[PDB]
Amino acid sequence: NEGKALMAIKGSFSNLVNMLLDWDDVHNSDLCSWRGVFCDNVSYSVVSLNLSSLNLGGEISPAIGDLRNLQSIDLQGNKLAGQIPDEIGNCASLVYLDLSENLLYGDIPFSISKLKQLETLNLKNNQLTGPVPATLTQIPNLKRLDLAGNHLTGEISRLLYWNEVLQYLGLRGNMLTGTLSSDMCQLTGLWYFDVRGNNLTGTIPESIGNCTSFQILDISYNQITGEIPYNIGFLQVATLSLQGNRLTGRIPEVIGLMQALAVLDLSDNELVGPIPPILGNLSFTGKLYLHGNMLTGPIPSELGNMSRLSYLQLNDNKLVGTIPPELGKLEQLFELNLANNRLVGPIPSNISSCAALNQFNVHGNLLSGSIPLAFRNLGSLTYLNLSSNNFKGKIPVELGHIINLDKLDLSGNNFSGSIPLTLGDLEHLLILNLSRNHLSGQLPAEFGNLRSIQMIDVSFNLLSGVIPTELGQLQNLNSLILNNNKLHGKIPDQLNCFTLVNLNVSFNNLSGI
């Protein structure tokens, strides 16, 4: 009776009996001992089905409509093709439907509205084609709705926002058009608004300050034009994400009062004007991504009052003036990215105080002066980028004592002297691009100890001497560019570097074959 429907279900699952080896009604009769099926201990009908993450790869047989007491159906990962069967809308006891991570196409079916007990509709990462039907409003207990990862069309009907119990709205990664309706803020118990990745035109609703239920607001990557309203300062969100759109005007000064924020994202927008220094009282935010804009003016020194900051990205703007030394105050800073600006003057020595600094990138500015020596104290640094600047002086010896360095890029500056031998014991290094400089003298043979190295470009320098013989030990180096230098002698016959796929010795003075 019920095993009949379970065997039509299994009947439509590609062609594998290895996985559901269990479902065998002649040598395993009780169906409540089968794999992924569960019967509540009283009525002893199947109430829960969990075939999640097995790849059975057929269809959802309509016989699923014949297990009436199913209140849980989790069929994720199985690569089920075809449409969502209509009969799934007469398991009225159903509470929780996860069909996420499959190859289902067709529409979200009308019969879904019959399931007046349903709480979680998880159709994530499928191929459903067609609109988010208005009838999803006729499920009074639905709390998590996510259609993320589909090819859904049509607009978001404001009817969908008149809903008092909804917790989670996941719409990311469809092709939804239209506007953000100013009735959007009638989802009074929602904590997650996600409409990212669609094609929504229109401005931000000025009446968005009433959305105090929201923990996360993600409208990013959506082609939204217009200004960022003042009432956005009333939002209680912790993740404010407005990235990737066409939001013009300047950064609302009222954002300086949104102290609850934990991730602040305005990046890849066409925002102009100065960086509001009031942001300095956002003492507890983790991320500030103002990059991608046309923000002009200096970096506010009050950004050192963001003590809890861990990810600062102001790159690719039109910021001018100096780097503030107060960035030493940010003791939690992992990634500092001020690239592609117009910053003038030297790197402050105070910045050597970010013991947690992990990425440092100031490529593409007008920075001058020398690397401060106190950079010996940046031991936690993973990624060091100072390319395309007017840095001068010498490469500090103590730079070799930043052990966790795996990407060093000093290209494009006027460094002098000979290369430090301590650069050799950067055991974890992977990329070393010191080119377009004025480096002189010997090519330090300690590069034989750069065990994990991948790409050495010390080209375009005044490097004299011979090519070290130890470079044959580098069993990971796939690009060795020594071009435009002053070296001589013959090439070592040891280049035993089976990884090399790109050598460039040229415009040198070698002697041999």
Binding site: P62, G82, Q83, P85, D86, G106, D107, P109, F110, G130, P131, P133, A134, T135, T137, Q138, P140, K143, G154, S157, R158, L159, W162, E164, V165, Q167, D183, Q186, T188, G189, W191, S213
Partner: protein
């Protein structure tokens, strides 16, 4: 250095004890040690007042304080929150399934949101719930109420959302002329009579759901006036009469379902569904509809779902269904259609079982 108003704080103490959460008594000040479900706003004198009071738990986050299933009750002390703007009860019971308290009236001017969802409340709707003139959102979904719907409800000149689903409500649908009303949900009730005329005077309406009731009479001619209407759901009712002359004014209407009106017994006029670009879902199944499949259902651009099953439709399937590849569900099963079908192979391969044609004798 702001402090709260004392009588409102004691009101909060009594309310919280009454619901079963004694822990709110240790609190040295209610509005500075804020738990999820209580909001406060200070006035000009740096004095906090209580504005939102909510129970129980829809989940963990949002986890309002739950109530004692065996003990709780609704304290009279609510009457002392002179600034209470919203009051929320969800899956919070009481010692004995009680009535809706009448003293909820006494906070008329401030209250703008009253939710009493799934509380097991017994008995009729207090009339003095109407004295809440300033209410914007009223929800009594899934209780056990019966008796009439108070006439005092047309005293909500500013109401926005009204949800009364899941009750034993008797009598007839209100003669509302509520200009601002957006969503009106009276479904799964015993309300009878006809669809009152006054309804179509509430132009702002977008959702009208009267399903699983016993409303009678035909459907109003002037339902065009509802020109903002998104969804109209009248399934499982006692409706009858002739189809309205026109629904053309009903732009933005996306979904209309008259399923289960077994005594409908009317044909579908050609011009009924002409100018409906935005129409998506049309369920007319099991309504004893007579006549032939009108072909102006073919020119419905956004139509995805068309249910006409379990009727007494007759004739051929119109050739212009060849001109329709947008539909995802088309139910013409269990009728008496004569001519053999004119569906192309694109359509048949894509639709598969989602196209129902069985139980037609002539095909």
């Amino acid at each position: 250095g702001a402090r709260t108003e004392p009588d409102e704080q004691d009101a909060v103490y009594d309310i919280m004890r009454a619901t079963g959460n004694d822990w709110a008594a240790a609190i040295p000040d209610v509005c500075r040690g804020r738990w999820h479900g209580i909001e406060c706003m200070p006035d000009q004198d740096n004095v906090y007042h209580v504005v939102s009071l909510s129970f129980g738990a829809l989940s963990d986050d949002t986890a309002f304080p739950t109530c004692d299933p065996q003990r709780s009750y609704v304290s009279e002390s609510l009457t002392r929150l002179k600034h209470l703007k919203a009051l929320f009860f969800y899956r919070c019971l009481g010692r004995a399934p009680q009535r809706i308290p009448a003293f909820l009236g006494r906070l008329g001017s401030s209250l703008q949101t009253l939710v009493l969802r799934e509380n097991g409340f017994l008995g009729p709707i207090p009339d003095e719930l109407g004295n809440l003139t300033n209410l914007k959102v009223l929800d009594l979904h899934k209780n056990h109420l019966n008796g009439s719907i108070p006439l005092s409800f047309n005293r909500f000149s500013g109401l926005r959302s009204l949800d009364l689903s899941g009750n034993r409500l008797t009598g007839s649908i209100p003669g509302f002329v509520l200009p601002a009303l957006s969503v009106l949900d009276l479904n799964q009730n015993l309300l009878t009579g006809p669809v009152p005329p006054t309804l179509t005077s509430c132009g702002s309406l977008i959702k009208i759901d009267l399903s699983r009731n016993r409303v009678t009479g035909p459907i109003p001619e002037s339902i065009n006036r509802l020109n903002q209407l998104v969804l109209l759901d009248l399934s499982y009712n006692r409706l009858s009469g002739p189809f309205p002359s026109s629904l053309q004014g009903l732009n933005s209407l996306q979904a209309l379902m008259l399923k289960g009106n077994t005594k409908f017994s009317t044909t579908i006029p050609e011009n009924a569904f002409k100018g409906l670009k935005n129409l998506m879902i049309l369920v007319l199944s099991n309504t004893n509809i007579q006549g032939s499949i009108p072909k102006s259902l073919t020119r419905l651009n956004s139509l995805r779902v068309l249910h006409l099953e379990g009727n007494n439709l007759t004739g051929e399937i119109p050739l212009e269904f060849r001109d329709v590849k947008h539909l995802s569900e088309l139910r013409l099963n269990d009728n008496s259609l004569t001519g053999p079908v004119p569906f192309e192979r694109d359509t048949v391969w894509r639709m598969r079982r989602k196209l129902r044609l069985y139980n037609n004798a002539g095909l």
